[PDB]
């Protein structure tokens, strides 16, 4: 969906703060989970062109956010992409 | 998991014992699917504005269950195999 | 998308002249308040007063109006624009609308009128012309 409990688990693991609901960390994390589920959804049906373009938009989002994260703190960025295993 | 309301028709002409057989069967399937009971009612015999296969009237029956989410997918074909049942529909509960 | 607050304030004051409302609000900046002070010196506008609220803003500007109707300014334009840099040597600066008009030219000494700029002999970016 993803289910609400998985979100509550996914957020707390990556927060830099006790109440860090925002942050590029948690944002790129939740968006990553959405990218994974939507990607598997694309795998289930190749005819989903709207889900595909929406996935492209979300890829634009992840690319912009990770780009700015590269623009800010490279250490947190490399630690994060190493934590996720994403980005080339 | 989510709530589900389900209606189905059993044959008006069926013997009460055979009706007990198909109802205990539908219940055994419904519990085999993990669909926990929430509530139920018996509309029973009612006249029809139009016949389905041929019958001029039918026995409505309904159930309300907390369940998957996966179970209805198996429940449908098993609701199709029986000649005794006429129709069945599973609507999500979001009043 | 809010590409330039100053040109935005200029379309604010021009539209304000078009609608003849007594006053309008603009977001704060020292660059804005300085040139607004320059207009306050030129007297085309009656008064300007800032009102603090977190964080930036909000200046309130009061348009001046003539005793015998007529718009106080017959024209206003920002020659400077993003995607087209402009520069002006101190002797090269035009005297727009001859003696009536005044340039608004930001310099190293700060924003200056074309007369004061000619006196200081200081060149700089030409922010806008008002006449």
């Amino acid at each position: 969906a993803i289910t609400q409990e998985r979100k509550n688990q996914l957020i707390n693991e990556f927060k830099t703060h006790e109440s860090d609901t925002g942050s590029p960390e948690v944002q790129i994390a939740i968006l990553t989970d959405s990218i994974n589920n939507l990607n598997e959804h694309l795998r289930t049906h190749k005819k989903d062109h709207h889900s595909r373009r929406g996935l492209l938009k979300m890829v634009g989002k992840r690319r912009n956010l990770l780009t700015y994260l590269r623009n800010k703190d490279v250490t947190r960025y490399r630690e994060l992409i190493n934590k996720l295993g994403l980005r080339r | 998991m989510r709530k589900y309301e389900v209606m189905y028709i059993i044959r008006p002409n069926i013997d009460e014992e055979s009706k007990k057989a198909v109802i205990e069967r539908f219940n055994n399937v419904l519990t085999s699917n993990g669909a926990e009971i929430t509530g139920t009612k018996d509309w029973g015999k009612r006249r029809l504005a139009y016949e389905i296969n041929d019958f001029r009237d039918g026995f409505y029956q309904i159930v309300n269950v907390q369940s998957d989410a996966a179970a209805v997918q198996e429940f449908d074909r098993l609701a199709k195999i029986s000649d005794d049942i006429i129709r069945h529909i599973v609507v999500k509960e979001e009043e | 998308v809010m590409t330039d607050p100053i040109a935005d304030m200029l379309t604010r004051i021009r539209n304000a002249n078009m609608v003849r409302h007594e006053k309008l609000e603009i977001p704060a900046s020292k660059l804005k308040r300085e040139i607004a002070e320059i207009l306050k010196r030129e007297g085309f506008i009656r008064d300007v007063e800032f009102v603090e609220d977190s964080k930036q803003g909000i200046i309130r500007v009061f348009l001046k109006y003539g005793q015998n109707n007529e718009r106080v300014i017959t024209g206003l334009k920002r020659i400077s624009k993003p995607g087209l840099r402009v520069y002006a040597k101190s002797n090269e600066v035009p005297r727009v609308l001859n003696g009536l008009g005044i340039a608004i030219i930001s310099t190293s000494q700060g924003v200056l009128t074309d007369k004061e700029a000619r006196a200081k002999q200081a060149g700089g970016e030409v922010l806008a012309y008002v006449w």
Partner: protein, 71 residues
Amino acid sequence: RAKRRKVCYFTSNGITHIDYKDVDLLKKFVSERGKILPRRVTGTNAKYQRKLTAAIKRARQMALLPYVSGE
């Protein structure tokens, strides 16, 4: 200007109905022609009328109401 005759009479004693389990009120919605009444008479907002539309379609799936009859 402005008021509609026989407007609503539903929100006044609603709401959240039915979604389709009832048969009496749906018997009220049906016309002698067997079709759902127009908003000009029913008085409902378009969203309520459309949720009512899908609801009555569900009722037709339940065969609780006629699909077509005499006029």
